[PDB]
Amino acid sequence: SSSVLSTSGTALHMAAAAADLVPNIYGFAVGGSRFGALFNASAIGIEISASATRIAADKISQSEIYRRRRQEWEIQRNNAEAEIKQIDAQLATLAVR
Amino acid sequence: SSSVLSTSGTALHMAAAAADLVPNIYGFAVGGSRFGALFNASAIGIEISASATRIAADKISQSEIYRRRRQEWEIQRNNAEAEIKQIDAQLATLAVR
Amino acid sequence: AGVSELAYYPENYIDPTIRIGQTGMMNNLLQQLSQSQLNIDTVEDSFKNYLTAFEDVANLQVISGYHDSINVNEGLTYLIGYSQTEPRIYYWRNVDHQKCQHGQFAANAWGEWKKIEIPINVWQENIRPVIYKSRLYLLWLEQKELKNESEDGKIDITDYILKLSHIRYDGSWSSPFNFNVTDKIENLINKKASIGMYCSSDYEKDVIIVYFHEKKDNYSFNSLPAREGMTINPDMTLSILTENDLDAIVKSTLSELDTRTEYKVNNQFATDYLAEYKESITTKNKLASFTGNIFDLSYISPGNGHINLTFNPSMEINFDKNISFLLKNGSDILVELNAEDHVASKPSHESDPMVYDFNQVKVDIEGYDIPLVSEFIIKQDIVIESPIHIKLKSKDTSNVISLHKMPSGTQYMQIGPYRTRLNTLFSRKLAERANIGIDNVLSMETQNLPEPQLGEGFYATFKLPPYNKEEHGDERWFKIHIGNIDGNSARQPYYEGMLSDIETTVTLFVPYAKGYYIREGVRLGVGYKKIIYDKSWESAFFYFDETKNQFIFINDADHDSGMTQQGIVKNIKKYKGFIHVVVMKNNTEPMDFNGANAIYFWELFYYTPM
Amino acid sequence: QKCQHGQFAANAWGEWKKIEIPINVWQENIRPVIYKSRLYLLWLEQKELKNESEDGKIDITDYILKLSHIRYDGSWSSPFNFNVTDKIENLINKKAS
Amino acid sequence: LLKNGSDILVELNAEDHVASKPSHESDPMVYDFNQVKVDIEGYDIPLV
């Protein structure tokens, strides 16, 4: 949800840049508008995109470390099942003795 | 506390955007106000929301890794209890011998 | 067996954590609650944080809506509400009219409020939604007033700008598309009047119609208001609108225009009719595919209830007393065509598709719903059925959803005789319980809190006779109808119930609007499988006493020289069909857990403690 | 309720709680108000813009009433603006506090 | 019965001074006695 929701701000930053290009002031002073607003919005959209794919990498890393934890538990379960079979057969040979 | 407190800034950013839409200048220059302040505040609220749910994911990850640590300690405790029972019964058969 | 058990015992499968359709506040509470350690202080702080969002969702107020279809009882309305904050933040929800089986919506029909993310600064709340190509478009105006307010260099620059945004599939909102409209708005503003806003979507032409009008107290179909027309393409390029097409549009939908006193909801724009049909329909016999089609459909309404259809049917057999066209009504054969007769330029066998192109088919039908069927019969047993549904746009005032705002704070939507609450005053009473204690908000006293009653209104309890196969008939129901509400003074199917054993009562809310109640006020009779009532004072006539500011049952006794709203009438009988009818004297109707905010109330009072 | 005879116990005093909405009062005209058992907060702001000259002497002062109430989670609402400068200038032309 | 802590101020009945006694055909029987007027003095009036 974080990786999806973080990418929805580039349209708003671009809209802020498009809204702040028209001249604010009027009258005897003709108008003041920041011209680099589009470049600043594109740069901040690139940065928020980099943050979004960073947290996507964190998400996939968490998924894979959970998968490896499950595989290790599978190893432990197979070892314990072999162990309980071995002790059962040792009980059998103890009954024979 | 971080995940809760980080989400309380969107109202302040929206209030800053609503306060910076009225024209600042007066007189022979009629007025200058940044028009994209609402879009910038909405984008920065989206980014701070993404950071808040990221740190919420970190919090729940820490809770689950503590739970797994406790479960592993439970495994070790059951193994050691079986071991002390086995060595006690070996002491019994050594007394018989 | 798992599916059948989920049908029979759903109690085994409900977990209190996940649920299909749980809200964003519920999910945020679950994020705030999912730890290894949960103290009482931690869970109470999380509950207060949930209560804040619940309060902010309960404190919404509907601005305006857009019914999707032509008729009210078919499509689904899209409402828009705002929050009580200085950066006023807007929401949208969706309510279906297919679910209201008789006038009243179930809680299944109401969708969740969904916050829109594009920040919107409206000028004088002129903001409408519009469903265009089944996509939620949003329209509003912004103003930029820059006044010097002096004499030396008096500068008065005001700029009005139309903005357009549509939703995406992933819930995100598009960038707003700017349109300078300040010349037309200054034309409507130099003539000093309140500026209205019509926003709808044509479907014949694929544009959206936006015209701003002045606000009169009545639009009388010949005194057209001052208007400024505009239209937007499917692409966000803007198209011009001539004054003749603008006058045709205003004459088409003057009825859906907001007056100075009452807010309307724009329906889908339609001039006279709408032809719902498909062009080409294939069959693909193993001999040959056929794919008969209707090419150039055109219909002109000559008057009110009539039509003049015109189209050029064809058949496209690709690899006599053979293939025949047939245009029928439900039972009337209107146009019957053949291949040997009236087919210009019969196709040669050297063409691999054989296109026929019969002639231009003209017909004149009357009525409001014309489900025509075009048939392409081949036999010697191959029929190509092609339906055409033509539906008239009813121009009644009942075909317009009206929403209102009581000064007490409630906000109801009224569709004719029916009214539906959209708001609540629960957050205004919630804080006194919440600051006292968390036990107090989850008490049953907080659930048994009263609410206002959606306009002036009154109630009436109708005690009913037992069912005994006579005086009722056979089918064992009752239809409490109504009369004399609108300018229409006739029998309308207000409420229906199933007739039961020895005693059954029903409390019905009956509104009042002071432009209502045409003759002797509202009458209210019973229906049956046998002969129904309401013939010359058989029903229950009520009227609003303006003097005592209360509602008077007039059909109480067999009164002589009794007062109605028209005046003193001579001979009044008793109400028949019922057993006891009386005014219910300020009922409560506390919280409506089957209402619009039923999901939020259920999530607060059951799902959150679970 | 805790002062059994004129004098408060230390049980009666609550903790200071910092409000988070930034407030710029004019001449300290700020009062709280308990409304529907909810802490509402009222104050006035001023915006003095004086040219202080003769050629184009511009004296624009604007007095604005702001309202904010607390929430259940301790957060504060957005301030609701109310233009009140006409009534304040009526009280100010008659020269008094 | 409207009383003070010990003073009986207004005493009403159902047969006496009740306008339009309700019928048994109504399932709630609303009575609506009359308009009760009284004049009390003092600063704390815990009426019952």
Short mmCIF file of N, CA and C in Angstrom, two decimals, chain A:
data_model
loop_
_atom_site.label_atom_id
_atom_site.label_comp_id
_atom_site.label_asym_id
_atom_site.label_seq_id
_atom_site.Cartn_x
_atom_site.Cartn_y
_atom_site.Cartn_z
N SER A 1 0.82 -1.20 0.00
CA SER A 1 0.00 0.00 0.00
C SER A 1 0.86 1.25 0.00
N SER A 2 1.99 1.22 0.71
CA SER A 2 2.90 2.36 0.68
C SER A 2 3.52 2.54 -0.69
N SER A 3 3.96 1.44 -1.31
CA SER A 3 4.58 1.52 -2.63
C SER A 3 3.59 1.95 -3.70
N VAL A 4 2.32 1.61 -3.55
CA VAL A 4 1.33 2.07 -4.51
C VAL A 4 0.97 3.53 -4.26
N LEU A 5 0.71 3.89 -3.01
CA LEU A 5 0.22 5.22 -2.68
C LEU A 5 1.27 6.30 -2.85
N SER A 6 2.56 5.95 -2.76
CA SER A 6 3.60 6.97 -2.87
C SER A 6 3.72 7.50 -4.29
N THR A 7 3.31 6.72 -5.28
CA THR A 7 3.45 7.12 -6.68
C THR A 7 2.32 7.99 -7.18
N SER A 8 1.35 8.33 -6.33
CA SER A 8 0.20 9.09 -6.76
C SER A 8 0.37 10.59 -6.53
N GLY A 9 1.59 11.06 -6.31
CA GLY A 9 1.80 12.46 -6.01
C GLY A 9 2.46 13.23 -7.13
N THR A 10 2.92 12.51 -8.15
CA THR A 10 3.55 13.17 -9.29
C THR A 10 2.56 13.97 -10.11
N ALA A 11 1.33 13.48 -10.25
CA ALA A 11 0.29 14.24 -10.92
C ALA A 11 -0.06 15.51 -10.17
N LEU A 12 -0.09 15.46 -8.84
CA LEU A 12 -0.34 16.64 -8.04
C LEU A 12 0.80 17.64 -8.08
N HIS A 13 2.04 17.17 -8.10
CA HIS A 13 3.17 18.09 -8.21
C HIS A 13 3.22 18.74 -9.58
N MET A 14 2.91 17.97 -10.63
CA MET A 14 2.83 18.54 -11.97
C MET A 14 1.68 19.53 -12.07
N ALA A 15 0.57 19.26 -11.39
CA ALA A 15 -0.55 20.19 -11.40
C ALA A 15 -0.21 21.47 -10.64
N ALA A 16 0.56 21.36 -9.56
CA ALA A 16 1.04 22.54 -8.86
C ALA A 16 1.97 23.37 -9.74
N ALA A 17 2.82 22.69 -10.51
CA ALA A 17 3.72 23.40 -11.41
C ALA A 17 2.96 24.09 -12.53
N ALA A 18 1.93 23.43 -13.06
CA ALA A 18 1.14 24.05 -14.12
C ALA A 18 0.29 25.19 -13.58
N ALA A 19 -0.11 25.12 -12.31
CA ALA A 19 -0.89 26.19 -11.72
C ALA A 19 -0.03 27.38 -11.33
N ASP A 20 1.24 27.16 -11.02
CA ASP A 20 2.12 28.25 -10.61
C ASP A 20 2.99 28.78 -11.74
N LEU A 21 2.56 28.63 -12.98
CA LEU A 21 3.26 29.23 -14.10
C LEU A 21 2.59 30.49 -14.61
N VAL A 22 1.30 30.67 -14.33
CA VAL A 22 0.59 31.88 -14.72
C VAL A 22 1.06 33.01 -13.80
N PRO A 23 1.08 34.26 -14.26
CA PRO A 23 1.59 35.34 -13.41
C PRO A 23 0.64 35.66 -12.27
N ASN A 24 1.19 35.75 -11.06
CA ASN A 24 0.39 36.04 -9.89
C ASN A 24 0.00 37.51 -9.85
N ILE A 25 1.00 38.39 -9.89
CA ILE A 25 0.76 39.81 -9.69
C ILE A 25 0.12 40.42 -10.92
N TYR A 26 -0.61 41.51 -10.72
CA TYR A 26 -1.20 42.26 -11.82
C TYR A 26 -1.03 43.74 -11.54
N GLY A 27 -1.50 44.55 -12.48
CA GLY A 27 -1.43 45.99 -12.32
C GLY A 27 -0.11 46.57 -12.78
N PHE A 28 0.41 47.54 -12.02
CA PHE A 28 1.61 48.27 -12.42
C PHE A 28 2.85 47.39 -12.38
N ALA A 29 2.85 46.34 -11.57
CA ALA A 29 3.80 45.25 -11.69
C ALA A 29 3.11 44.14 -12.47
N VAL A 30 3.74 43.69 -13.55
CA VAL A 30 2.98 42.96 -14.56
C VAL A 30 2.72 41.52 -14.14
N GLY A 31 3.71 40.84 -13.58
CA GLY A 31 3.44 39.51 -13.10
C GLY A 31 4.64 38.69 -12.69
N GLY A 32 4.52 38.00 -11.57
CA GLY A 32 5.59 37.16 -11.08
C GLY A 32 5.18 35.71 -10.97
N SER A 33 5.90 34.84 -11.67
CA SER A 33 5.62 33.41 -11.66
C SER A 33 6.94 32.66 -11.75
N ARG A 34 7.09 31.64 -10.91
CA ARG A 34 8.32 30.86 -10.92
C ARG A 34 8.37 29.99 -12.17
N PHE A 35 9.40 30.19 -12.98
CA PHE A 35 9.50 29.52 -14.26
C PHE A 35 10.03 28.10 -14.14
N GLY A 36 10.75 27.80 -13.06
CA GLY A 36 11.34 26.49 -12.91
C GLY A 36 10.48 25.54 -12.12
N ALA A 37 9.19 25.86 -12.01
CA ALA A 37 8.28 25.02 -11.23
C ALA A 37 8.08 23.67 -11.89
N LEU A 38 8.05 23.64 -13.22
CA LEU A 38 7.90 22.37 -13.93
C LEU A 38 9.13 21.49 -13.76
N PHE A 39 10.32 22.08 -13.79
CA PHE A 39 11.54 21.31 -13.56
C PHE A 39 11.61 20.81 -12.13
N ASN A 40 11.19 21.63 -11.17
CA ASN A 40 11.19 21.21 -9.78
C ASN A 40 10.18 20.09 -9.54
N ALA A 41 9.03 20.16 -10.20
CA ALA A 41 8.03 19.11 -10.06
C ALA A 41 8.48 17.82 -10.72
N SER A 42 9.18 17.92 -11.85
CA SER A 42 9.70 16.71 -12.48
C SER A 42 10.80 16.07 -11.65
N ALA A 43 11.66 16.89 -11.04
CA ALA A 43 12.71 16.36 -10.17
C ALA A 43 12.12 15.71 -8.93
N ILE A 44 11.10 16.32 -8.34
CA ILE A 44 10.53 15.75 -7.13
C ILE A 44 9.68 14.53 -7.46
N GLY A 45 9.15 14.44 -8.68
CA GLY A 45 8.48 13.22 -9.10
C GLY A 45 9.46 12.09 -9.33
N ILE A 46 10.65 12.41 -9.85
CA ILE A 46 11.70 11.41 -10.00
C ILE A 46 12.17 10.91 -8.64
N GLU A 47 12.30 11.81 -7.66
CA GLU A 47 12.71 11.39 -6.33
C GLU A 47 11.65 10.54 -5.64
N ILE A 48 10.37 10.89 -5.80
CA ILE A 48 9.34 10.09 -5.16
C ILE A 48 9.18 8.75 -5.87
N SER A 49 9.50 8.69 -7.17
CA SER A 49 9.53 7.42 -7.87
C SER A 49 10.66 6.53 -7.38
N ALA A 50 11.82 7.13 -7.11
CA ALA A 50 12.95 6.37 -6.58
C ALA A 50 12.64 5.82 -5.19
N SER A 51 11.97 6.62 -4.36
CA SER A 51 11.55 6.14 -3.05
C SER A 51 10.53 5.01 -3.16
N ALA A 52 9.63 5.09 -4.15
CA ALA A 52 8.63 4.05 -4.32
C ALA A 52 9.25 2.73 -4.77
N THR A 53 10.21 2.77 -5.69
CA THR A 53 10.82 1.50 -6.06
C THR A 53 11.78 0.99 -5.00
N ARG A 54 12.35 1.87 -4.17
CA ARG A 54 13.11 1.43 -3.01
C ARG A 54 12.24 0.64 -2.04
N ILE A 55 11.05 1.16 -1.72
CA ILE A 55 10.20 0.44 -0.79
C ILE A 55 9.57 -0.79 -1.44
N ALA A 56 9.46 -0.81 -2.77
CA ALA A 56 9.07 -2.04 -3.45
C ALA A 56 10.14 -3.12 -3.30
N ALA A 57 11.41 -2.71 -3.38
CA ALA A 57 12.51 -3.65 -3.13
C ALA A 57 12.48 -4.18 -1.71
N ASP A 58 12.14 -3.32 -0.74
CA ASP A 58 12.01 -3.78 0.64
C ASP A 58 10.87 -4.79 0.80
N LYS A 59 9.76 -4.56 0.10
CA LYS A 59 8.62 -5.47 0.16
C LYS A 59 8.97 -6.85 -0.39
N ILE A 60 9.63 -6.88 -1.55
CA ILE A 60 9.98 -8.17 -2.13
C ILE A 60 11.06 -8.87 -1.30
N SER A 61 11.94 -8.10 -0.66
CA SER A 61 12.92 -8.69 0.25
C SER A 61 12.25 -9.34 1.45
N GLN A 62 11.21 -8.70 1.99
CA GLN A 62 10.49 -9.30 3.12
C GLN A 62 9.76 -10.57 2.71
N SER A 63 9.19 -10.58 1.50
CA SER A 63 8.54 -11.79 1.00
C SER A 63 9.53 -12.94 0.86
N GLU A 64 10.71 -12.66 0.33
CA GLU A 64 11.68 -13.72 0.13
C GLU A 64 12.28 -14.21 1.44
N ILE A 65 12.45 -13.32 2.42
CA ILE A 65 12.99 -13.80 3.69
C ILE A 65 11.95 -14.62 4.44
N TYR A 66 10.65 -14.34 4.23
CA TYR A 66 9.63 -15.20 4.80
C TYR A 66 9.62 -16.57 4.14
N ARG A 67 9.84 -16.60 2.82
CA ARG A 67 9.92 -17.88 2.11
C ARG A 67 11.11 -18.71 2.59
N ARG A 68 12.25 -18.07 2.82
CA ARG A 68 13.42 -18.80 3.31
C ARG A 68 13.21 -19.31 4.73
N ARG A 69 12.50 -18.54 5.57
CA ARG A 69 12.16 -19.01 6.91
C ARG A 69 11.28 -20.25 6.86
N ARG A 70 10.31 -20.26 5.93
CA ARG A 70 9.46 -21.44 5.78
C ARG A 70 10.24 -22.65 5.29
N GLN A 71 11.19 -22.44 4.37
CA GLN A 71 12.00 -23.55 3.88
C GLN A 71 12.87 -24.14 4.98
N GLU A 72 13.42 -23.28 5.84
CA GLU A 72 14.21 -23.77 6.97
C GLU A 72 13.36 -24.56 7.96
N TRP A 73 12.12 -24.12 8.19
CA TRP A 73 11.21 -24.90 9.03
C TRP A 73 10.89 -26.25 8.42
N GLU A 74 10.79 -26.30 7.09
CA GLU A 74 10.59 -27.58 6.41
C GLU A 74 11.76 -28.52 6.62
N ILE A 75 12.99 -27.98 6.60
CA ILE A 75 14.18 -28.78 6.89
C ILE A 75 14.11 -29.36 8.29
N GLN A 76 13.75 -28.52 9.26
CA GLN A 76 13.68 -28.96 10.65
C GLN A 76 12.60 -30.02 10.85
N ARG A 77 11.48 -29.88 10.15
CA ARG A 77 10.39 -30.85 10.27
C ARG A 77 10.79 -32.20 9.70
N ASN A 78 11.48 -32.20 8.56
CA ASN A 78 11.93 -33.47 7.99
C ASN A 78 12.97 -34.15 8.86
N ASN A 79 13.86 -33.35 9.48
CA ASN A 79 14.85 -33.92 10.39
C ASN A 79 14.20 -34.54 11.61
N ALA A 80 13.19 -33.87 12.17
CA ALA A 80 12.54 -34.41 13.36
C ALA A 80 11.70 -35.64 13.03
N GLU A 81 11.16 -35.71 11.82
CA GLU A 81 10.40 -36.90 11.43
C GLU A 81 11.31 -38.10 11.24
N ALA A 82 12.48 -37.89 10.64
CA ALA A 82 13.47 -38.96 10.56
C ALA A 82 13.92 -39.41 11.94
N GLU A 83 14.07 -38.45 12.86
CA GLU A 83 14.49 -38.77 14.22
C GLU A 83 13.45 -39.60 14.96
N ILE A 84 12.16 -39.27 14.80
CA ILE A 84 11.15 -40.03 15.53
C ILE A 84 10.99 -41.43 14.92
N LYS A 85 11.20 -41.58 13.61
CA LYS A 85 11.22 -42.92 13.02
C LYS A 85 12.39 -43.75 13.55
N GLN A 86 13.56 -43.13 13.68
CA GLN A 86 14.74 -43.84 14.17
C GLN A 86 14.58 -44.28 15.62
N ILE A 87 14.01 -43.42 16.46
CA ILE A 87 13.82 -43.80 17.86
C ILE A 87 12.73 -44.86 17.99
N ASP A 88 11.74 -44.86 17.08
CA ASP A 88 10.74 -45.92 17.09
C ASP A 88 11.35 -47.27 16.73
N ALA A 89 12.23 -47.30 15.73
CA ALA A 89 12.89 -48.56 15.39
C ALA A 89 13.88 -49.00 16.47
N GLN A 90 14.47 -48.04 17.19
CA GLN A 90 15.29 -48.40 18.34
C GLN A 90 14.46 -48.99 19.47
N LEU A 91 13.23 -48.51 19.65
CA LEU A 91 12.31 -49.14 20.59
C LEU A 91 11.99 -50.57 20.17
N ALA A 92 11.86 -50.81 18.87
CA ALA A 92 11.61 -52.16 18.37
C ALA A 92 12.78 -53.10 18.68
N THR A 93 14.01 -52.66 18.41
CA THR A 93 15.14 -53.54 18.69
C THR A 93 15.39 -53.70 20.19
N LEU A 94 14.98 -52.72 21.00
CA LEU A 94 15.04 -52.90 22.44
C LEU A 94 14.02 -53.92 22.93
N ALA A 95 12.84 -53.96 22.32
CA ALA A 95 11.88 -55.01 22.67
C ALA A 95 12.39 -56.39 22.29
N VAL A 96 13.06 -56.49 21.14
CA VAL A 96 13.64 -57.77 20.72
C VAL A 96 14.74 -58.21 21.69
N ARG A 97 15.57 -57.27 22.13
CA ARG A 97 16.61 -57.62 23.10
C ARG A 97 16.02 -57.98 24.46
#
